[PDB]
């Protein structure tokens, strides 16, 4: 998986920086030019998503009593189910990650900092393993960045 490790490192970092509230000081070295650009975009849009839907988000994080790793694998599924209607777009995609972030904050909050990495993987695994050909038809992370340019 060439352009998946690039997705993985994007989601892990956004989620880690959100949980830890501070930006990481090490360069994002396995996403390169393409992937660092989208992190800049993701930070921008995902923080608005989080801020715009803070109540909706909070409502859902409640219902999914989120503790161990299986709760994470379970959430992965919910996310798979989002796209069942046959529709794929970045709004969805980003919203999925923004929620990751939200949840990841909660995880560090409830002393489960180490469930944040399994969470990142599933999100990545969800998208890339289920929506490979949609992602590809958009020039991947480049499309993400051009969608949210504004």
């Amino acid at each position: 998986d060439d352009l998946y490790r690039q997705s993985l490192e994007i989601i892990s970092r956004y989620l880690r920086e959100q949980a830890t509230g501070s930006k990481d000081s090490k360069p994002l070295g396995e996403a390169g030019a393409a992937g660092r650009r989208a992190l800049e975009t993701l930070r921008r849009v995902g923080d608005g998503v989080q801020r715009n839907h803070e109540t909706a988000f909070q409502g859902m994080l409640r219902k999914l009593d989120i503790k161990n790793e299986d709760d994470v694998k379970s959430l992965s599924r919910v996310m798979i189910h989002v796209f069942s209607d046959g529709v794929t777009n970045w709004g969805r995609i980003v919203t999925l990650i923004s929620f990751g972030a939200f949840v990841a904050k909660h995880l560090k909050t409830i002393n489960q900092e180490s469930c944040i990495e399994p969470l990142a993987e599933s999100i990545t695994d969800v998208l890339v393993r289920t929506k490979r050909d949609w992602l590809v038809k958009q020039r991947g992370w480049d499309g993400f960045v051009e969608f949210f340019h504004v």
Partner: peptide, 21 residues
Amino acid sequence: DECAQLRRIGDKVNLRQKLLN
């Protein structure tokens, strides 16, 4: 996600941008 909340937010985030592009 009994009520399609995340999808519907996804689509709203997509709508707002669409109307911005």
